[PDB]
Write a protein that binds this ligand. Sequence first.
Ligand SMILES: [Cl-]
Lengths: 279, 287, 284, 291
Amino acid sequence: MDDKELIEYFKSQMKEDPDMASAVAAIRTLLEFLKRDKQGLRANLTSAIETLCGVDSSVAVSSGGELFLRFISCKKIMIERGELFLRRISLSRNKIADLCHTFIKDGATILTHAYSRVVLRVLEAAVAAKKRFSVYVTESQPDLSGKKMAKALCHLNVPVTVVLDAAVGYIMEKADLVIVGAEGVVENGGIINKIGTNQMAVCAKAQNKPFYVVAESFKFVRLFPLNQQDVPDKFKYLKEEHPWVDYTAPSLITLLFTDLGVLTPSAVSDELIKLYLAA
Amino acid sequence: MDDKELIEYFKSQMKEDPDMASAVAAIRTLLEFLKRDKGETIQGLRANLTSAIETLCGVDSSVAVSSGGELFLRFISKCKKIMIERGELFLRRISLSRNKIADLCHTFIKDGATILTHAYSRVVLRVLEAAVAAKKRFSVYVTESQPDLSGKKMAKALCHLNVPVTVVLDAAVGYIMEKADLVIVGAEGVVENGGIINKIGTNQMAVCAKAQNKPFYVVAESFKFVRLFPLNQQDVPDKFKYKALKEEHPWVDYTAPSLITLLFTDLGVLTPSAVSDELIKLYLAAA
Amino acid sequence: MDDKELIEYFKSQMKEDPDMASAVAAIRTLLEFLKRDKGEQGLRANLTSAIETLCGVDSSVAVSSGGELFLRFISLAKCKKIMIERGELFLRRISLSRNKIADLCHTFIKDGATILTHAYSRVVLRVLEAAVAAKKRFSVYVTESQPDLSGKKMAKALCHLNVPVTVVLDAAVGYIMEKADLVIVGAEGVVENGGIINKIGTNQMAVCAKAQNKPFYVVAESFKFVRLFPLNQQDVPDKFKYLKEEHPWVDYTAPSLITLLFTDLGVLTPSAVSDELIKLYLAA
Amino acid sequence: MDDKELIEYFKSQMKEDPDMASAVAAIRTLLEFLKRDKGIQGLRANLTSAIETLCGVDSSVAVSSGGELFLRFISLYSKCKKIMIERGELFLRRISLSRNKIADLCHTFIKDGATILTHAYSRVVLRVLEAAVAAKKRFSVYVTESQPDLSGKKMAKALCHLNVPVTVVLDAAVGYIMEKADLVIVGAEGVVENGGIINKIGTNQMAVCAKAQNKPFYVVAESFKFVRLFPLNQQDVPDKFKYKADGQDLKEEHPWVDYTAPSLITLLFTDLGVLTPSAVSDELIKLYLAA
Ligand SMILES: [Cl-]
């Protein structure tokens, strides 16, 4: 392969299935790349392509890519362990759905932000459990991905209501819990997500509503932010500011439903070590 | 409805369905008895004559029949009463228990895991069903469980879900333990200290799993939470046991909380030590 | 003799005399094999071990350890065929083992004790008799021991001595353990690390006795010391062990689950067996 | 030794040393009774039992829990060789260590400059606060006078004689005063299986008010006070523990103790360690089985 063929197999892998995590698409592309040819001679040939996939700022593409590489270790066994990794990361969503939909009381009113493939999967699991619940979702500027989310939920016949980003503090009082996804989960158990998440978390804590995060383990990223500035620019981009993500501290999170299990923010560091040192 | 009717009604509830739990069949019978108790009159006597029947049903040594029965009468605080509204709301909820537990627990059965269980358990059965429905691949070892051999019945039920299963002697438990990844067991009752009262042979299976670091999981409904705190076997009421050249034949033994890893309930996953807080909330439900 | 006779002789040793250990019954048929066998040389040494395996009819571990020990200590030498006199010697010595043991044990069974046992054991019966008839009052608990219910058989034997005895289900060992003072058990075989192979169910009884701090004592003859070094159930040879069903006749109990072993060689803690075993196998 | 003797020996022990836990005074006289008892083994048993209950003439849960635990730990020609007395003294030697272990564990949680609120008189809380002055910590106390025996006042002097600032307040001013406190430290007459506690009437009220203002509620108590009860409400505390203790119009209400559920308690400081209410059931099993 090469640059032309990478930014392809990848970019279209996502077209054939827009339900697929940005990260999985990429890992899928690498695994494909290893299925190319003519030792460490190739090991550098790969690293040179994750950066290439820097054609998508996603924290996940970065961290998942790193994890995929670390999992690998003539070069057959590498295309094997890599397949055993892909097959594994694509089981995360079912796991997160099983684990989390259980925390949704029947008759609950849930508040979410923007669009999340995993959250959606969680709510589907809940209807499949015969749970009756309502949903409020932010419209989420500037791409209005919350309206997208509302549409998807409407098709699963879930009563959903779209409110303005500015109305979270206002609507909070009538919600029982908050469930949002993540772009990445940092070392301290906090999360990086679509701009607006932080405010929702702050507002939920003020009224004592549990704040749940659902995200795959491959989004575990090696960063320890102390505030909004410690979040690398590459992941978020005196008259106008436009960050796509913001950071939400562990103190503002109740639990994180991950494929590694249900976790408190502080328990994340232990899991993140076991994850990166897998084998 | 009189005593004759009750015992008949209760027995035909399980009749029309062997897969029903004893406490649920018993709770439904209190609901009918309640309904068919217009002959009564004072809101007090309904609640009073209703206690008289629990005992009648007590003709089922089962622990759950007591706790389910007690919990039922509790969830219910003139001649015209809305108690029945609560009694049906109560029935409506304990009927979701077994299933909440199955989709709560199956997620924890890893692929290729070998599971060890004891005798026959309706809850454990629903759990495994959810696991094959989840497309998971596992195998099972189950004690034949003397003296009624319910383990063999359990095994056949599993065989009909196409789950690979092997029946082994109650004595082969410590032997087979090394080839199991985890242990899943049901319960006749969940005690205040997070421990459990179950079919004889459970205690030693737990001790054995403990010595090999094998996780030990209990899956049980909340109506099985009972107001007892035993320190050893002797502390278990005979009403539930049937015991302590002679012979002894206790039908149940006691498993301490130090021997249980997690309990999977309709109230969520619990560690043994957290059972006491949930039992409180559960018994003071009405408030 | 010939295969036929061999087995027929063996089976008719324990049948008319169950009192006798399989191992001992095996060397007896072996003395006769040898005796009744005339006309050789190495032929003898080979035809004799090539039929000792035949006595495998008894998947019993003792037949194997016994046969070897017996064979090893008579081979030291048709005048050389006076191995027979060593065989009578050996068979004469091993027939004192039960007794040295029942003696090394009268001290540990204290007046008023409650003993928990598993299945049937001739050596255990002996020890308790040498204790009761020896002015001691105790009561016993024994597992019925599926599948041949040999536990009930043991019970009856204990009743005949008017010792109070209660039979419980194998499933009730962890239930009855709190009311036991100690457990005494026999062994089909003592392995090189001080552990033991015994009737299925023995293992879990030891694990429970240990969690409740109850001393676990094994009572067995030195001719049961076998050359095997298992670390788990999987290491025990199938040859001794025998919708699916698994029916292992015996299981292994690691040495850390054993307090003391009483043998004709003296009372031993599990970590002493290995050295004894060798100091035993290597005897002139 | 007959009943009159027991009682006098028991009250002497308490007059001898007023800082001695009531339960400690009790097992001591049980030990003395066991030493004199000139009566077979079975006798000795119900004898050292049909007196422990006689000591029950101090309707305190502790005296009951202590005795029970003592008989348990002590229990097991043969006659005389009773190694019971030896075990007895050993048990006695360990429980007398407890109070200090609590002092050490707890004072660590008293932030310098903190205002602590207490209820009635508690010997262990007194020891905890001494362990605090010793650690060079500066704090101030607020304590309820505690009707009807006004034991809170006596607590205030003890503290005054230790030089710690202390203010006495009416039992009715706890909700009012809560505002000024940083935390609540109260003792216990008994710790029940669910982690809750039985203590001087007025305790529950303080814990409920503490929780409402998110003030940490700490309990300091020796493990011989772990009792086998699982109360669900006030009516569940046996009457022998709340009455005779220390027409139309009725003062018919003079309970000496009340119950404080596990959800109103933050931490229990024990010789067995710093435990959260849920962890109590496992320690109570270990305590009662250890033997
Ligand atoms: Cl998906």
